[PDB]
């Protein structure tokens, strides 16, 4: 969940990144 | 970048800036 | 269409985008 | 109140729509 | 002018708006 | 701190001018 790792806790630019294509 | 919780629109603008010409996907499934 | 709550400038930018040409009108009374 | 309709409940399309011109 | 509160997106749009050509700085530090 | 007058409390036209250059 990108809304559970990001919107409720923190995402390092890394972490936000494994959302990209 | 930010060390802040990103939700809805600001997560959607945040992943368009950080992925430049790779897009991305968003399904959010909470 | 999202199953969210929308508020200021989020609720505002929904109805932009929802009436199209029709335009629209934000009055908040809360 | 749309603050009240949209932004403390959820507001169906139809629901927003009610704010068109 | 909106009485309400501008949080980060929005407090960062707001002050772009309100400064004009005069520009501004942003350095949160809470 | 601006995240503390303008995201905290309300921050009428004049004090957020207080931030620009
Ligand atoms: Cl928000
Ligand atoms: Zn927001």
Same mark, same amino acid.
């Given at each position: 969940?990108?809304?559970?790792?990001?919107?409720?806790?923190?995402?390092?630019? %890394?972490?936000?990144?494994? %959302?990209?294509? | 970048?930010?060390?802040?919780?990103?939700?809805?629109?600001?997560?959607?603008?945040?992943?368009?800036?950080?992925?430049?010409?790779?897009?991305?996907?968003?399904?959010?499934?909470?």
């Amino acid at each position: 969940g990108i809304v559970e790792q990001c919107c409720t806790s923190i995402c390092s630019l %890394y972490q936000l990144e494994n %959302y990209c294509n | 970048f930010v060390n802040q919780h990103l939700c809805x629109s600001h997560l959607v603008e945040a992943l368009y800036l950080v992925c430049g010409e790779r897009g991305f996907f968003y399904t959010p499934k909470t």
